[PDB]
Design an enzyme around this catalytic site. Structure first.
Site, mmCIF file in Angstrom:
data_model
loop_
_atom_site.group_PDB
_atom_site.id
_atom_site.type_symbol
_atom_site.label_atom_id
_atom_site.label_comp_id
_atom_site.label_asym_id
_atom_site.label_seq_id
_atom_site.Cartn_x
_atom_site.Cartn_y
_atom_site.Cartn_z
ATOM 1 N N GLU A 44 45.313 -29.770 1.280
ATOM 2 C CA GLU A 44 46.371 -30.769 1.173
ATOM 3 C C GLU A 44 45.801 -32.184 1.308
ATOM 4 O O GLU A 44 44.712 -32.384 1.844
ATOM 5 C CB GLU A 44 47.462 -30.513 2.236
ATOM 6 C CG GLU A 44 48.706 -31.434 2.187
ATOM 7 C CD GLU A 44 49.456 -31.348 0.863
ATOM 8 O OE1 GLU A 44 49.051 -32.036 -0.102
ATOM 9 O OE2 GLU A 44 50.402 -30.529 0.758
ATOM 10 N N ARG A 95 48.023 -21.964 5.633
ATOM 11 C CA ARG A 95 49.313 -21.794 4.934
ATOM 12 C C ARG A 95 49.085 -21.377 3.462
ATOM 13 O O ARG A 95 49.837 -20.530 2.882
ATOM 14 C CB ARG A 95 50.179 -23.067 5.045
ATOM 15 C CG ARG A 95 49.533 -24.382 4.581
ATOM 16 C CD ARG A 95 50.333 -25.507 5.229
ATOM 17 N NE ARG A 95 50.027 -26.847 4.743
ATOM 18 C CZ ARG A 95 49.202 -27.691 5.350
ATOM 19 N NH1 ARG A 95 48.550 -27.323 6.447
ATOM 20 N NH2 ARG A 95 49.024 -28.905 4.853
ATOM 21 N N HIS A 119 47.887 -26.346 -2.468
ATOM 22 C CA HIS A 119 48.877 -27.263 -1.901
ATOM 23 C C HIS A 119 49.435 -28.195 -2.968
ATOM 24 O O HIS A 119 48.814 -28.365 -4.010
ATOM 25 C CB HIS A 119 48.244 -28.080 -0.783
ATOM 26 C CG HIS A 119 47.556 -27.245 0.244
ATOM 27 N ND1 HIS A 119 48.164 -26.875 1.431
ATOM 28 C CD2 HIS A 119 46.329 -26.680 0.255
ATOM 29 C CE1 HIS A 119 47.323 -26.142 2.134
ATOM 30 N NE2 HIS A 119 46.198 -26.005 1.447
ATOM 31 N N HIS A 144 52.054 -23.059 -1.762
ATOM 32 C CA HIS A 144 52.570 -22.373 -0.574
ATOM 33 C C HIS A 144 53.953 -22.902 -0.197
ATOM 34 O O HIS A 144 54.297 -24.024 -0.535
ATOM 35 C CB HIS A 144 51.597 -22.551 0.600
ATOM 36 C CG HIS A 144 51.523 -23.959 1.123
ATOM 37 N ND1 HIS A 144 52.509 -24.521 1.909
ATOM 38 C CD2 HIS A 144 50.568 -24.911 0.987
ATOM 39 C CE1 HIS A 144 52.171 -25.760 2.221
ATOM 40 N NE2 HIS A 144 50.993 -26.021 1.679
#
Ligand SMILES: O=C1c2ccccc2C(=O)c2c1cc(S(=O)(=O)O)c(O)c2O
Ligand SMILES: O=C1c2ccccc2C(=O)c2c1cc(S(=O)(=O)O)c(O)c2O
Ligand SMILES: [Cl-]
Lengths: 237, 234
Positions: free
Chosen positions: B88, B61, B185, B10
């Site tokens: 993440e 995200r 991520h 992202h």
């Protein structure tokens, strides 16, 4: 004391909801998208939480769901898509407006179809502009010849929606998962007919509002304990 | 090759613009990051890519990156699977702090150590931390066991909890012939790339995956890359 929420998508592009959009994968119009945002904002204001979401494989319903999940900050929810929640397949009529339909088939036959529970429209033939677009769409490649419709009566639509309801959705509700379903007029008709035990005539008279969360409260037998309720400001309700 | 795998990292988040550590904080894309996802999606569209199943994290995200791509390639109907294991890296007590606050509180040397370390975690996110309830008490993690829910992660921790999902849920799908898209991520994807290419800790720490860009692997039946990763686009 379960809570179930349904939402019917709003307006699609090119006035296709007044043109038997059916299995054609029409997108939401900006208006339809705004409707979905308002529905989502109603759910947010009411503090609703879900644990799992079901929708069709048609982008107008999927985008409605995404808009709602975005508004209520639950984009992380598991989402299950199924062709079994697709809109009714309107066969050869798909894409036609009212005038074109009556011109092609006559008012008498249109009256019959409009009012009939078990008569399908004519099949979508190879000369139809949407024939290869729908029948050879990769999202239906796992369906058998009998499963992929060329046309559907309302009876047909409900008949293929309810197996998914019984096999995939009911067990989640009985586990206590709070379910959101984002789908279409006739597939949602199938669910409502099953929940409320309605007659064929009654279900054909029922028109679910678009972009409005529809709330069911179900007892331990998945029988509604009260009439369906609509979510939103006082007016919209 | 037998198989094709596509990864996408992202782009810019709202907290990236603030220079703040996000980690498991669920920051949305910035307008710029969203545009990056559209450009990646258009690159996949122009290249004619088709998928059969998508994996992403439980962070918006990444999820919004995925949605943006699926919209661009007209495959919104695909099955999508979300998992915390692709989240993440969890930055523990550093979560919410910007660059200045971090160097002010911990000093340049310690940030330097954390920066280049594969196995030293940042301080734990304690109950008095401003985002403690926001993250640790978020209901999306209610099914995690005590040992699964991190208070902080080294990169090693992150990889360690990502790879079980890779091995148990993604690998079987690839060998079933499913064309997989993973939208996630930097550090979870690092975990996947490290396992795929058999990279060292040093190498994986030097690897910075570009954002918003489709990353294409061509894999043999044992899921060994047959060539370097390729980037898709203009
Ligand atoms: O013409 C139809 C029709 C034709 C073929 C299959 C199905 C339908 C149909 O279902 C239908 C129709 C018209 C109306 S309308 O004029 O009263 O708005 C409806 O409400 C409606 O449901
Ligand atoms: O400050 C950090 C940091 C702090 C605490 C734990 C981990 C890291 C970290 O991993 C890191 C950092 C900075 C950079 S950067 O300034 O060179 O862009 C990195 O590339 C990078 O990987
Ligand atoms: Cl989704």
């Amino acid at each position: 004391a379960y809570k179930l929420v349904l939402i019917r998508h709003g307006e699609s592009a090119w006035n296709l909801e007044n043109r038997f959009s059916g299995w054609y994968d029409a997108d939401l119009s900006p208006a339809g998208h705004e409707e979905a945002k308002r529905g989502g904002q109603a759910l947010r204001d009411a503090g609703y939480e879900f644990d799992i979401c079901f929708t069709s494989v048609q982008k107008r319903a999927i985008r409605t769901l995404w808009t709602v999940l975005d508004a209520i900050d639950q984009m992380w929810l598991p989402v299950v898509r199924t062709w079994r929640l697709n809109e009714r397949h309107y066969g050869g009529l798909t894409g036609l407006n009212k005038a074109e339909t009556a011109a092609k088939h006559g008012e008498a036959q249109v009256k019959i179809w409009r009012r009939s529970y078990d008569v399908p429209p004519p099949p979508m033939e190879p000369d139809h502009p949407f024939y290869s677009n729908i029948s050879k769409d990769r999202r239906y490649a796992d369906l058998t010849e009998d499963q992929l419709p060329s046309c559907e009566s309302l009876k047909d639509t409900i008949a293929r929606a309810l197996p998914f309801w019984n096999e995939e959705i009911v067990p989640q509700i009985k586990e206590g998962k709070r379910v959101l379903i984002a789908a279409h007029g006739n597939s949602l008709r199938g669910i409502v007919k099953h929940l409320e035990g309605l007659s064929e005539e009654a279900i054909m008279e029922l028109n679910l509002p678009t972009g409005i969360p529809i709330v069911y409260e179900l007892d331990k037998n998945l029988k509604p304990i009260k009439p369906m309720q609509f979510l939103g400001d006082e007016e919209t309700v």
